[PDB]
Amino acid sequence: SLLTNFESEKTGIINTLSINQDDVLFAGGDNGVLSFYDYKSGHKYQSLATREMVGSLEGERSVLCSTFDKTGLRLITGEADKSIKIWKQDETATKESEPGLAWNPNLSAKRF
Amino acid sequence: TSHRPQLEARSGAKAAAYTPTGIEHARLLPGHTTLKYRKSWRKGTAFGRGYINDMTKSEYHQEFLHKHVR
Amino acid sequence: KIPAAVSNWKNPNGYTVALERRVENNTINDGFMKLSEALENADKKARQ
Amino acid sequence: KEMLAEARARLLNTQGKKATRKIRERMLEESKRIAELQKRRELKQAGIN
Amino acid sequence: RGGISYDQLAKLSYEKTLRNLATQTQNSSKQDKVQKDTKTGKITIADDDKLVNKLAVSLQSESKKRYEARKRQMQNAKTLYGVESFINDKNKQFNEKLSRES
Amino acid sequence: IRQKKARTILQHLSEAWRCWKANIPWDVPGMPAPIKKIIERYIKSKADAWVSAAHYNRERIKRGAHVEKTMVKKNLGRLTRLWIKNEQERQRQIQKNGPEITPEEATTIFSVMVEWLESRSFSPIPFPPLTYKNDTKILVLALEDLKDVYASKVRLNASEREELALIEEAYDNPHDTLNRIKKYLLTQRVFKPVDITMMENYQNISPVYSVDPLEKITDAYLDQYLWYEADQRKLFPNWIKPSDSEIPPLLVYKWTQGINNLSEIWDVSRGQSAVLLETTLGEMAEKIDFTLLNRLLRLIVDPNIADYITAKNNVVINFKDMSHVNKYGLIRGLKFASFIFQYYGLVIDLLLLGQERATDLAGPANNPNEFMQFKSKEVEKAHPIRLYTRYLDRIYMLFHFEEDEGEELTDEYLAENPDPNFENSIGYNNRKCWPKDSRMRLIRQDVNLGRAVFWEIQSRVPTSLTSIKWENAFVSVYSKNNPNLLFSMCGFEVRILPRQRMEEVVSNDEGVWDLVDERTKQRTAKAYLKVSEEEIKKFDSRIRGILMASGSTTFTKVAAKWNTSLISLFTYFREAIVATEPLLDILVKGETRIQNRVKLGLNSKMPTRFPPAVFYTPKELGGLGMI
Amino acid sequence: KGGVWTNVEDQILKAAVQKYGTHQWSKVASLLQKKTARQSELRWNEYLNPKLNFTEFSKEEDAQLLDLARELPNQWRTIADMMARPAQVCV
RNA sequence: CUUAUGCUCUUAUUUACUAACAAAAUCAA
């Protein structure tokens, strides 16, 4: 059964997926844009863009593969810039200060 | 013509319905049969007194082509 | 929409395609400017 | 002009050995076929099938 | 401007076939069921022998018109352009493609 | 759409991969920019695999561990692509960022060179007149110089067929082709493009420039003309090497005799010391600037020829696809290119010696010194640079220091560059061929004095002209602590040990020179000789050249090429093969491998089938005639 | 033996580069008797290329030329890339 | 029931095709 449809629209070629125990879903982008989705609701709550390198091509900013660790508080992304980035969930952040992106659906994009 | 790129790869669907041969290969011999489980002279003269993601612009590549050309 | 590929090396069907398909903008900096004028001045000085 | 007549013919001939030979074998195969069919017709003119 | 998407062009060609079908019914006016099987699940539809012929003749005639329209377009396409040097028809054909890209 | 764009869009890749290999920028005019991001991304990915395999196989070839015959040529192809890319990049960033020399540097360079030529009363080389008494012979020497390539050739293709016609027509018409050459030196300023072919030497890949033959004729005339007038008017001083007076192993012998014959080097009664320095001039000919070159050649030569020389270095250079414009660096492949380089050597050198000491070395203009002379003891003594010489781009300096001068020179270095962890002996390099006892011992006051000399000298020449680095530099110190003064001039590697520091005098073999003091006629030192490891690896690379080029050649040619290579080996350095162990191993490894090559001509590597009468009997009796 | 270019051979070479491409010069010299693939490459890159600039001299060009030839003395392949012109015309 | 050239063994010379055979290098006059 189709459980839910995420707000994945506007991402283009998602290279990799990773799922946390905490339902943080990861979607590595070929555009370099990496987006974090709540798995239960299918909502983007963070969108981020990496830096490519000191000197490298603008197409190389892309995530190719990813995993969480056993704990789930680290995200390891191997990217096409010939590097590994370790993404870390930011502590000292309460609901206030950073709710993320607003829970705003539209019926025009008929995803639901 | 006669020199073409692939439109598709050779699929495993066709090889699954063939009959086998049972020829005996050297690398399919029994080996590792047991799994392991986890538990003043200086005055007269004219004048005295870091990583880039490019294999061709790298410092090692410059030190290469200076030594291997000469 | 992708342009068709007109190569300068290969031509597998041997096509005849016009010359405009097959076939910088900066200036010299003041380093060349100041270099040549200083050498000429030194040459004029050496001539003196 | 003889250089130009050679150049005019070389620029307008694009195939190579393999395509020209394939053309020749295809024409000769059809010529063998057309011959064999009219044989059967001429034998059918005699009534022998 | 743009091209026409395959949803809209499906609709427009749907409407064109409706308009042509309506003019056939108008011209036919001027010039003057379902049974399901018990044994099998197969279904039988009673039809007139007319309008099956008329559909088949129309589809053939539309195919003829498009065939001869493209054939006359073939005739124009090899008679119009003669500026650039070529080798065969396929050279001029491909160099018409590079002119369309400009 | 799935099937129709796949044809088109991958042909864009294949075209773009060709354009990267050819250093064409690959601009498709109206291209959907995400697709241009993709194709640039994978071609950078294929670039990294292509460049890494080029580095990986080149280390594997230098080790000499089972590389294919095809893969040697494939690796020559990939490295000559990458060398020209490094060349084309270096041309572009020079043109963006301007000349490396500042105008103050070029003013100082020009002022020194003017002062030198004014001091020597040098009259510049004229343009060759209509009535020039030496003119037909200089053309004769030039055309024989061009012919001697083809006196040894058999089978020719188009470019040398029309070349050999030109020499023969120049023989038939001397006065016609002299007027054509003088007409080219006046008027011609644009030249046909030059092709680079690059030779395999299995340790380095060296460039070779092929010039147009009509340009080759007027180059060789200009080559032979300028050198005659330069040596006639005494342009180059006595210490510029190579000179026509001696062969290079006689240069090394006169150098060690000249080291011996200064007064009181070996005396270390006081704390006085002696330092020899070896430096490459790095990218000397790669970093010559033409605007300086043209102006400095106005000093030395009539401006027409000086204009010709500057014009000829600016040509299009093309490999197969890659074509660019040599608008900065000098091309060695020209015939006259010899003359500029030694002249540009003199510009570098007058910085180092200064106006006073280079006057003291080369002596007055009416009565020049020889290669090892001074007009007195005092003119020798007045400055610590006792001996200077320059062999092409290597530099050999000899410093005699009193206690006070050595102490000032090392204290100012340590004041400018302190050493609390005493790491000056870490990066210091000496000859790992000589044994550790008689190598240069790493003792602090000599190590710090050695770096302080080099730090003094690296300041004398700017980094815009040449790149004098410590990684290429070799310093030998002679002291109370070090009895050995050891250096490498030419494929020789020489260790000089004096007689008073020998403790015991033992008779040696003939690989040891006996250095003779002149005025006592007494043998006062011994210069031990070995081969450089570089020339050893050149000879091993040479033998692999015989073995890989000859696939199915006749047996007596393989044996003949071995004779040519081994005679060339043993004639140039003969004495140093006594003392070198790994050269003798490579002689064995080469000769057995060539005997294995003849054995592979048959299907037998049997010893009993091949007694040494098979290989070593001369050709008159029917053998290979191997040596 | 070093021959001059007729306008016949000029038209073969332009039709050759139109089919073969600018890199296959030995393909071009096969059609072109008496001439070399070096000579064929040299003329197309010095004369026959329609991208080249054979026209009148504006006073901006003449002031630019006398600047460049004073600043870069006798570097004509260098100056002709700065002027975007053929080199012997620039001389 | 229409009936029409049987190539000789060796040696020499000449010509044609063919080996997709081979080859003056260092060096001494």
Residues 317-356 of F with CB within 7 A of strand H? none
Measured distance CA(F466)–CA(B50) in Å, rounded: 24
Please report residues of B whose CB lies closer than 8 A to that of D19. 1
Show which residues on chain A lie within 8 Å of chain B, measured between beta carbons.
52-56, 60, 81-82
Strand partners, A26: A18, A36
Burial F132-152 (b: 16+ CB within 10 A, else e): eeebeebbebbbeebeeeeee
- Please write down the long-range contacts of F612-615, taking CB distance under 8 Å and 24 or more positions apart: F615/F559
Measured distance CA(F212)–CA(G42) in Å, rounded: 12
Q: How far C17 CA sits from the closest chain D CA (Å)?
A: 12
Of G23, G73, G76, Cβ closest to residue F190: G76
Q: Which amino acid is at F88?
A: Q
User: Which B residues in the span 25-44 are in contact with F, Cβ-Cβ below 8 Å?
Assistant: 41-42, 44
Q: How far F306 CA sits from the closest chain C CA (Å)?
A: 15
Question: Half-sphere exposure of G29 toward its Cβ, with a 13 Å CA cutoff?
Answer: 15
C1' of H28 to CA of F518 (Å): 38
Residue F335 burial class via C-beta count within 10 angstroms: exposed 0-12, middle 13-18, buried 19 and up: buried
Q: What is the 3 state secondary structure string of F587-604?
A: HHHHHHHHHHHHHHHCCC
Alpha-carbon Rg of chain G, whole angstroms?
16
Closest CA to F126 of F118, F136, F134: F134
Q: Provide the 3-class DSSP secondary structure of residue F108.
A: helix
**Chains in contact with B via at least 3 Cβ–Cβ pairs below 8 Å:** A, D, F
CA angle, residues F580, F585, F591, in degrees to nearest 5: 125
Q: Provide the 3-class DSSP secondary structure of residue A26.
A: strand
Say yes or no for a CB contact (<8 Å) between D11 and G19. Answer: yes
Query: Do chain G and C touch: 3 or more Cβ pairs under 8 angstroms?
Result: yes
CA distances from B26 to B29, B30, B31, G8 (A): 6, 10, 11, 68
Q: How far G4 CA sits from the closest chain C CA (Å)?
A: 24
Please report residues of D whose CB lies closer than 8 A to that of E87. 11-12, 14
- Token pair, residue F33, equals 């920019």
Helix F158-172 with F213-232: angle, nearest 10 deg = 50
User: Do F209 and F198 form a contact (C-beta atoms < 8 A)?
Assistant: no
Q: How far D19 CA sits from the closest chain G CA (Å)?
A: 19
Helix E89-101 with E53-80: angle, nearest 10 deg = 90
Which run of H or of E encompasses F198?
strand F194-200
C1' of H3 to CA of D38 (Å): 36
Q: What is the residue extent of each domain of chain E?
A: 1-102
Query: Phi and psi dihedrals of D13, rounded to 5?
Result: -135, 110
Q: How far A30 CA sits from the closest chain F CA (Å)?
A: 10
C1' of H24 to CA of F615 (Å): 21
Scanning every strand, the nucleotide with its C1' closest to F553's CA turns out to be: H22
Please report residues of C whose CB lies closer than 8 A to that of F8. 2-5
Q: Where are the alpha helices (DSSP H) in F210-315?
A: 213-232, 248-260, 290-300, 303-313
- Please write down the long-range contacts of D13-16, taking CB distance under 8 Å and 24 or more positions apart: D14/C13, D14/C14, D14/E87, D14/E88, D15/C14
Query: Phi and psi dihedrals of F15, rounded to 5?
Result: -65, -40
Closest CA to F479 of F186, F272, F292: F272
Q: How far D44 CA sits from the closest chain E CA (Å)?
A: 39
Question: Tokens 């693939």 map to which residue?
Answer: G37
User: Which F residues in the span 381-400 are in contact with B, Cβ-Cβ below 8 Å?
Assistant: 383-385
Residue B25 burial class via C-beta count within 10 angstroms: exposed 0-12, middle 13-18, buried 19 and up: exposed
Q: What resolution does the deposited structure have, in angstroms?
A: 3.9
Residues 44-83 of F with CB within 7 A of strand H? none
Measured distance CA(F330)–CA(F341) in Å, rounded: 9
Closest CA to F534 of F576, F484, F588, F483: F576
DSSP chain E: -----TTHHHHHHHHHHHHHHHHHHHHHHH----EE-SSSS-EE----STTTHHHHHHHHHHHHHHHHHHHHHHHHHHHH--SS--SSHHHHHHHHHHHHH-
- Residue F31 contacts A where some CB pair is shorter than 8 Å: no
For residue F156, say whether its CB is under 7 Å from any atom of strand H: no
Please report residues of C whose CB lies closer than 8 A to that of F115. none
CA dihedral A85, A90, A91, A92 (to 10 degrees): 140
User: Do B48 and F459 form a contact (C-beta atoms < 8 A)?
Assistant: yes
Say whether the peptide bond before residue A105 is cis (omega within 30 degrees of 0): no
Please report residues of E whose CB lies closer than 8 A to that of C23. none
User: Do G48 and F284 form a contact (C-beta atoms < 8 A)?
Assistant: no
Measured distance CA(D32)–CA(F552) in Å, rounded: 48
Q: Provide the 3-class DSSP secondary structure of residue A33.
A: strand
Closest-CA residue of E relative to C16 is E86
Q: How far D10 CA sits from the closest chain E CA (Å)?
A: 11
> Could you say which DSSP state residue A22 is in?
T
Closest CA to F496 of F250, F259, F270: F259
Q: How was this structure determined?
A: cryo-EM
- Residue A60 contacts F where some CB pair is shorter than 8 Å: yes
* Residue F553: how many other CB atoms lie within 10 Å: 13
CA distances from F527 to C48, F477, F486, F523 (A): 52, 15, 9, 11
C1' of H6 to CA of D39 (Å): 40
Please report residues of G whose CB lies closer than 8 A to that of F310. 73-75
Torsion sign (Cα): B61, B63, B66, B68? negative
Closest CA to F238 of F368, F48, F331, F375: F368
Q: Provide the 3-class DSSP secondary structure of residue B46.
A: coil
Measured distance CA(F389)–CA(F411) in Å, rounded: 27
Measured distance CA(F119)–CA(F359) in Å, rounded: 9
- Token pair, residue F94, equals 């020079």
> Could you say which DSSP state residue F436 is in?
T
Say yes or no for a CB contact (<8 Å) between G8 and D4. Answer: yes
Closest CA to C5 of E85, E101, D15: E101
Please report residues of B whose CB lies closer than 8 A to that of A53. 52-53
Please report residues of E whose CB lies closer than 8 A to that of C14. 87
Residue F271 burial class via C-beta count within 10 angstroms: exposed 0-12, middle 13-18, buried 19 and up: middle
- Token pair, residue F512, equals 């040891």
- Residue F38 contacts A where some CB pair is shorter than 8 Å: yes
By C-alpha to C1' distance, H26 is nearest to: F564
For residue F560, say whether its CB is under 7 Å from any atom of strand H: yes
* Residue F198: how many other CB atoms lie within 10 Å: 18
Q: Provide the 3-class DSSP secondary structure of residue F620.
A: coil
For residue F2, say whether its CB is under 7 Å from any atom of strand H: no
- Please write down the long-range contacts of F613-618, taking CB distance under 8 Å and 24 or more positions apart: F615/F559
Strand partners, A47: A35
Say yes or no for a CB contact (<8 Å) between B52 and A60. Answer: no
Scanning every strand, the nucleotide with its C1' closest to F557's CA turns out to be: H25
Q: Which nucleotides of H are covered by protein (CB under 7 A)?
A: 22-27
Residues 471-500 of F with CB within 7 A of strand H? none
Alpha carbon distance, N-terminus to C-terminus of chain B: 44
User: Which D residues in the span 10-49 are in contact with C, Cβ-Cβ below 8 Å?
Assistant: 11, 14-15
Question: Tokens 């003779």 map to which residue?
Answer: F516
- Residue C19 contacts E where some CB pair is shorter than 8 Å: no
DSSP A57-95: -SS---EEEEEE-SSSSEEEEEETTTEEEEEE--SS--T
Please report residues of B whose CB lies closer than 8 A to that of F49. none
Query: Do chain G and F touch: 3 or more Cβ pairs under 8 angstroms?
Result: yes
Please report residues of F whose CB lies closer than 8 A to that of G74. 189, 290, 294, 307, 310-311, 314
Q: How far B4 CA sits from the closest chain D CA (Å)?
A: 15
Scanning every strand, the nucleotide with its C1' closest to F568's CA turns out to be: H26
CA angle, residues E47, E50, E53, in degrees to nearest 5: 105
- Residue C3 contacts E where some CB pair is shorter than 8 Å: yes
Scanning every strand, the nucleotide with its C1' closest to F625's CA turns out to be: H26
Q: Provide the 3-class DSSP secondary structure of residue G91.
A: coil
Burial F27-44 (b: 16+ CB within 10 A, else e): ebeeeeeeebbbbbbebb
For residue F521, say whether its CB is under 7 Å from any atom of strand H: no
Length of chain F as a residue count = 627
